[PDB]
Amino acid sequence: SHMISVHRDTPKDNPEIPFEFTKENLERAKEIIAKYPPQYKKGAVMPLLDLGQRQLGFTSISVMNYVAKYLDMPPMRVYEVATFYTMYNRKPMGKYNVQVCTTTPCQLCGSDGIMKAITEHLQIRPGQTTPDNLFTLQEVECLGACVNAPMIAVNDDFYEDLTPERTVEILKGFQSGDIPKPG
Amino acid sequence: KSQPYDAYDKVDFDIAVGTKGDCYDRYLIRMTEFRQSLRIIEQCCNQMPPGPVKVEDFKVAPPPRALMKEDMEALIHHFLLYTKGYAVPAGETYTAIEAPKGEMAVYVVSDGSERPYRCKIRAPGFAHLGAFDHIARGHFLPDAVAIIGTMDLVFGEVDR
Amino acid sequence: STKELTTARIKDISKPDENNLQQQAPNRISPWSKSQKPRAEAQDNVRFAVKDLAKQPRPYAAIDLIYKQPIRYIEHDNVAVCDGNGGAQGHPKVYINLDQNKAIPCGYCGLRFAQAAFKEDIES
Amino acid sequence: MSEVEPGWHYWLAYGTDVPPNQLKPEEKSVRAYPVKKHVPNLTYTDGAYVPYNTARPKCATWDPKVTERP
Amino acid sequence: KEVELTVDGVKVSIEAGSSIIQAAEKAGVTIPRYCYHEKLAVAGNCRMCLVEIERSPKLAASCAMPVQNGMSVLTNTPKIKKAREGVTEMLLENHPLDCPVCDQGGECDLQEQSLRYGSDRGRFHEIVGKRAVENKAIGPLIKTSMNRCIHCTRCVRFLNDVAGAPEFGTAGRGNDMQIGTYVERNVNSELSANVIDLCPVGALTSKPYAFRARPWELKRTETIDVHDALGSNVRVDTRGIEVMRVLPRLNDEINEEWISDKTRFACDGLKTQRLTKPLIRQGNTFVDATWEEALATIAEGFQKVQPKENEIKAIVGSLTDLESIVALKDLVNKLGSENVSTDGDATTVPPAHGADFRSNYIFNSTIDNIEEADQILLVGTNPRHEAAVLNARIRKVWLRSDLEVHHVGEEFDSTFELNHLGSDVNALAKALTGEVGKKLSEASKPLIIIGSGVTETQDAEAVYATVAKFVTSNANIVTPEWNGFNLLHREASRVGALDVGFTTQSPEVANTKAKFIYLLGADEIVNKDIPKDAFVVYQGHHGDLGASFADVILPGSAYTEKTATYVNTEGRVQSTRAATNPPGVAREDWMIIRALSEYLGATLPYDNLYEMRSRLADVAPHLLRHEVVEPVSEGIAKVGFQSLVKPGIQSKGVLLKNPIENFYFTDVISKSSPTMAKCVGSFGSKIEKIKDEKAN
Amino acid sequence: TDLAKELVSGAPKELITERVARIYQEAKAATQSGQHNTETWKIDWDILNKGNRWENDLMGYQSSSDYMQGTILKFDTREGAIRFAKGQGWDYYIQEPKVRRFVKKDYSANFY
Ligand code: SF4
Numbered sequence A: 001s002h003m004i005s006v007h008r009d010t011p012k013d014n015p016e017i018p019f020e021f022t023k024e025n026l027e028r029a030k031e032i033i034a035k036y037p038p039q040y041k042k043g044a045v046m047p048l049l050d051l052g053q054r055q056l057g058f059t060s061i062s063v064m065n066y067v068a069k070y071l072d073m074p075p076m077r078v079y080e081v082a083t084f085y086t087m088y089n090r091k092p093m094g095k096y097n098v099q100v101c102t103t104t105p106c107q108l109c110g111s112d113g114i115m116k117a118i119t120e121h122l123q124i125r126p127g128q129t130t131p132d133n134l135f136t137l138q139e140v141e142c143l144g145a146c147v148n149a150p151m152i153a154v155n156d157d158f159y160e161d162l163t164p165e166r167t168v169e170i171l172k173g174f175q176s177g178d179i180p181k182p183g
Numbered sequence B: 001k002s003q004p005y006d007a008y009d010k011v012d013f014d015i016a017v018g019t020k021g022d023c024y025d026r027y028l029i030r031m032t033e034f035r036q037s038l039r040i041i042e043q044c045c046n047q048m049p050p051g052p053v054k055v056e057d058f059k060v061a062p063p064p065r066a067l068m069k070e071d072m073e074a075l076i077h078h079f080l081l082y083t084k085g086y087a088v089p090a091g092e093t094y095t096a097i098e099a100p101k102g103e104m105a106v107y108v109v110s111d112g113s114e115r116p117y118r119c120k121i122r123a124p125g126f127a128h129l130g131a132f133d134h135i136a137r138g139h140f141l142p143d144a145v146a147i148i149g150t151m152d153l154v155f156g157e158v159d160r
Numbered sequence C: 001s002t003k004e005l006t007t008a009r010i011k012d013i014s015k016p017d018e019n020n021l022q023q024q025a026p027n028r029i030s031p032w033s034k035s036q037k038p039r040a041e042a043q044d045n046v047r048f049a050v051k052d053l054a055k056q057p058r059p060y061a062a063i064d065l066i067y068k069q070p071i072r073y074i075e076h077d078n079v080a081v082c083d084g085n086g087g088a089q090g091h092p093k094v095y096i097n098l099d100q101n102k103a104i105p106c107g108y109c110g111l112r113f114a115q116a117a118f119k120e121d122i123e124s
Numbered sequence D: 001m002s003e004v005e006p007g008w009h010y011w012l013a014y015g016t017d018v019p020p021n022q023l024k025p026e027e028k029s030v031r032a033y034p035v036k037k038h039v040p041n042l043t044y045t046d047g048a049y050v051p052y053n054t055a056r057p058k059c060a061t062w063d064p065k066v067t068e069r070p
Numbered sequence E: 001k002e003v004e005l006t007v008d009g010v011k012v013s014i015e016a017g018s019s020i021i022q023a024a025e026k027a028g029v030t031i032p033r034y035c036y037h038e039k040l041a042v043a044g045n046c047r048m049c050l051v052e053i054e055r056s057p058k059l060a061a062s063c064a065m066p067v068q069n070g071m072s073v074l075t076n077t078p079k080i081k082k083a084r085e086g087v088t089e090m091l092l093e094n095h096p097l098d099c100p101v102c103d104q105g106g107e108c109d110l111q112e113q114s115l116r117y118g119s120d121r122g123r124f125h126e127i128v129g130k131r132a133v134e135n136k137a138i139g140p141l142i143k144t145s146m147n148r149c150i151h152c153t154r155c156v157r158f159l160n161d162v163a164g165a166p167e168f169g170t171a172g173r174g175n176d177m178q179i180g181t182y183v184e185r186n187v188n189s190e191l192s193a194n195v196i197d198l199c200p201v202g203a204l205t206s207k208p209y210a211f212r213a214r215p216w217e218l219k220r221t222e223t224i225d226v227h228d229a230l231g232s233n234v235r236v237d238t239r240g241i242e243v244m245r246v247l248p249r250l251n252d253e254i255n256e257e258w259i260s261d262k263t264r265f266a267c268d269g270l271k272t273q274r275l276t277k278p279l280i281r282q283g284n285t286f287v288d289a290t291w292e293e294a295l296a297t298i299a300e301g302f303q304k305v306q307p308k309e310n311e312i313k314a315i316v317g318s319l320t321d322l323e324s325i326v327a328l329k330d331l332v333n334k335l336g337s338e339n340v341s342t343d344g345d346a347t348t349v350p351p352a353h354g355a356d357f358r359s360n361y362i363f364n365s366t367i368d369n370i371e372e373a374d375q376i377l378l379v380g381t382n383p384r385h386e387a388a389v390l391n392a393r394i395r396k397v398w399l400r401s402d403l404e405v406h407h408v409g410e411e412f413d414s415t416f417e418l419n420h421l422g423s424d425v426n427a428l429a430k431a432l433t434g435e436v437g438k439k440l441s442e443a444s445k446p447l448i449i450i451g452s453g454v455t456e457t458q459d460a461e462a463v464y465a466t467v468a469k470f471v472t473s474n475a476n477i478v479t480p481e482w483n484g485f486n487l488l489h490r491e492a493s494r495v496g497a498l499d500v501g502f503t504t505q506s507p508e509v510a511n512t513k514a515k516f517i518y519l520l521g522a523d524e525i526v527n528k529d530i531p532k533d534a535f536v537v538y539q540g541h542h543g544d545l546g547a548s549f550a551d552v553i554l555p556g557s558a559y560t561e562k563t564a565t566y567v568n569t570e571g572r573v574q575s576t577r578a579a580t581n582p583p584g585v586a587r588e589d590w591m592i593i594r595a596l597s598e599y600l601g602a603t604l605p606y607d608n609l610y611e612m613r614s615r616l617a618d619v620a621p622h623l624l625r626h627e628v629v630e631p632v633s634e635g636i637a638k639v640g641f642q643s644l645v646k647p648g649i650q651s652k653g654v655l656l657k658n659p660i661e662n663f664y665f666t667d668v669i670s671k672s673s674p675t676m677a678k679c680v681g682s683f684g685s686k687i688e689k690i691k692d693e694k695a696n
Numbered sequence F: 001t002d003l004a005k006e007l008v009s010g011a012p013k014e015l016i017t018e019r020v021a022r023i024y025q026e027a028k029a030a031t032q033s034g035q036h037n038t039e040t041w042k043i044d045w046d047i048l049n050k051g052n053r054w055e056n057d058l059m060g061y062q063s064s065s066d067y068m069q070g071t072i073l074k075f076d077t078r079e080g081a082i083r084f085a086k087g088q089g090w091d092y093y094i095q096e097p098k099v100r101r102f103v104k105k106d107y108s109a110n111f112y
């Protein structure tokens, strides 16, 4: 993946941008803390970061500072957690994250063809974003769905047993505005 | 011949030995050593083998410059050999070689550091000149000049 | 003015004169180190009383020459490799990171490397 | 002997078989600074090299100032 | 609890739970290490200390593996030799070839341990190249070259646990993991610069010291620090006439391998604003003069004003050596004068702690007993800024035990948890009578610490009365073995000046309008009266407000240029060692007074340093016992505390303000330091600015 | 021991009546974890209060008049250093080396 260990202030991502959990996420965050002992409430950083990431769209520096202040922890401790796990998107990202597995079990059944077909359709190389901020192609490791090796992931949904002609249809569905059937 | 060193055991040469023990015998020996040295030089030219010229140990011998500028370990060894030097195990030695003047020996004392603790230099000329009184007594003044010359005296060696 | 001749500055506020013997270098007026003794002060010694200052060794300032070299811009790579452009006759090979949005010089040669994507930002 | 240019000093001493005027363009030295006429040894003249310290003094004295008491 | 183990056939015995690497050191067996430090938490991320347990098929890290009874440890088998070469090769795989341009060259642990335990040749010929890491900006003190880091986490462990600054950590995963602060900010800690010493490689280096020297050039002198009253032991490195850098040296009783950023980075002020020549004022300008002319002018100026008994005033600064204090006192005494004091602004003419009893103004518990403290009370003090090393020691005890620290006075940013009570004597009275005073009474080894800024407030008398009454009325504070009363000074000359009685206990004397003022390094004289017609002589090593207020200036030597005696806050006598000579025609400070004495008709009987030091014994017998604290006996200590109990004295309820305003500007050397100027601009006066405004 | 061996050593009288030697054991450097240099006792001389170092004006060289400035003797034991200093009739003083207090260190303490 794209691993950078240094944050650079941007108009899209800088600590000045205010962030706060909505009144819906304020209540649901309290249940998360209740799943941990009171003297070890620092173990809820991971769910809180994802809660903010889904609300805002990505794990901005404002979200990391907000979680640090919420749990009475130094900001650097939250920075270590967010930068260690690859599912914390420290950049705006697109509406649908395209995750293509390239590991050996998936590579045997033609995962290379899946990557080739998508690159020439969306016209974005892996790690890039479509101009309309709709798609995001990402190269990912094993996701566990290796028995159905030609497998891809869009946001939170899996898509197994694919072919290059099938992957275009899935992209066409999201481009049009229709959710393809996952399976 | 008594304690061969540095490939002197792989060349053939002879030693001239006098009988009367005077200057003329020593002149003849030094002329034979001239031809025997030329005999050895010819063998070294023919029998020069390939291979490294220094020990393949970068903790004592400096690494090559090209390897120094490309290898991390070579740079470290180059840096430390020129700034701190190499440590020598503690102990002492008395190493002697057949110097052209005679027997030249060094008594080096090591303390486990990178600097010798003591370095006694044994000079054959220093010992030769100490016998000048015993040898030149009764001779005439021009004979002393010959005796000084026949001892092959260099006073840097004597006064090291 | 004797203030530009005795103070270390990043740049000379005027154009150096190659025929002026009070400059630190023929191509640079001011010294380039805080501990570098000014040439004008050094030449004001009893040993220069009857000595011609023109024939004294006056090598060119290396700080002004190195910054006349254009920045090397690297395409499709965030790491620059420099070994002195001579190989075995250069300097030890080092790798320079180019992630930051600025030119970063070599630790030995002083040649500055940067990415081509930052070319517009650096030049302005 | 010092009047011989450093280019031809090496050739005279049998250090090489290629004179500096026969040098390949890649074998020549590249100077970013201008080149002047050869200057021989300047001893026994007024142009002799005069050594000097290139470093400033290691301690700077205090610049005195007077402040009036209230 | 001892366990008899074996290390390469050597019997060892240490406490249960000790690491193998600790037992190996006790047995004389050396094990290479990068990530292990005897003052940090245990990490096993470097794998250089691997040893072979006798009956086990796995190699154990000796820094983390606990010791067992009957355990036999091998440390020099060919299997371990393979491991050391293999780990060394991995460390040097991506390391940059930077030794010539790297300031750690001659003192690099990576170089020495790779030479000693690694192979002589490398095998990395990859054309893809090494890893490249950008350099982080964390302020003007720590220079970063992160290509050279070996990911050993010494800096992370120290700054989080010892220094208490959690803004430094490890961000990333795998080969892309980078040490730093992630965001663009600086490290805010008075002990941050100790990270430079702990970093075994050139990744973290001193920025002021960068490129200026190699360790083999420097000469090492074991002297003491005078920038605070702790007397931290330091190793001053010199290259001929100039001091290059200051490093800490081990002393578990005083500083424990740590020094503050003020101590090690103020050495560059020794080259700026120095007093090198005698100066004589002529109107509004100072002109140079000879020593004979300067001393004659003082004698001529002495007879111009004709001062009487108490019209001769002597003031001693924070950096004044003890030999000069006694010499100035005796010269003052020979002139029939007793008006001697320090440049402080104590409200009461006799300080509330007084000078009759040593126990009233020293750290009676000693710094090394903080490891045993159960309860600590801070009365109007800021240990983080006044005693940076001592503050870190309290945090270490706080982390590893249930020690509770209560604070009375002005709140401050602390490295531990403070149970704040109030900001006046009224809260202290409530605390010592309430639950807070019950904890101290029930504590087995309680501690009470009074700040040096208490005597500079209008409630100085009340604070020492409240504590003394509580101390005398409770039998556990003062015992034959324990003494819980402590005073934390911030100047290295206070305890030495008080041990010799260089203070006026007579209010009438201190109110005299002086005609001849002798400033011996005194510079905080804005609030101390100086008559416009008075004749002022300043003796010191830096030109400052004291020099500007003088008429004749006598240049002296600094603490690095003289063998001088300093008594720290715990009553420990320590002697400096001269590393260089004073610049110009500056002289030793005690010789200037002796030479001037002959010009005033009061020739002192001192001729050499030994005679001067013999005078110290006459003034106080404990001043010739170096590195030894002479404690006050239990019976005498109670009388001194009882003398502080003064009934019929009111409490004004004023704030116990912290004495230090700017951490980097506390004396002449620090003010003259260009590095401290950069620290104020970047870190701030209170070290509170997280963003560097002078770094681009 | 009691013999005044300085009467026959040939050294100048200034070594006795004007110079002070320090018997010390080298402290561990704060920048390195090695302790090899701390295993031996050494003797050096205190600097001259004047003339220890001064700057030569021609080239900036470090001029000196102290002939003992670069002499550092090495001893294996403290008693040997004292016996030699007493034998030569030197004015000396001993700096006792600082000993590190032993504290147990285990990985379990990182959580307990
Ligand atoms: S840290 Fe050590 S090995 Fe690395 S470049 Fe510096 S001196 Fe060389």
Ligand code: SF4
Binding pocket: E148, E149, E150, E151, E152, E153, E154, E155, E156, E179, E198, E199, E200, E201, E203, E204
């Ligand atoms: S920067 Fe230095 S101290 Fe910190 S982990 Fe790297 S090598 Fe260790």
Ligand code: FES
Binding pocket: A101, A102, A103, A104, A105, A106, A141, A142, A143, A144, A145, A146, A149, A151
């Ligand atoms: S190998 Fe691709 S999902 Fe497991």
Ligand code: FES
Binding pocket: E032, E033, E034, E035, E036, E043, E044, E045, E046, E047, E048, E049, E050, E061, E062, E063, E064
């Ligand atoms: S010293 Fe034990 S693994 Fe680092």
Ligand SMILES: [K+]
Binding pocket: E104, E195, E196, E197, E198, E199, E200, E201, E202, E203, E204, E205
């Ligand atoms: K370091």
Ligand SMILES: [Zn+2]
Binding pocket: C082, C083, C084, C091, C106, C107, C108, C109, C110, C111
């Ligand atoms: Zn280069």
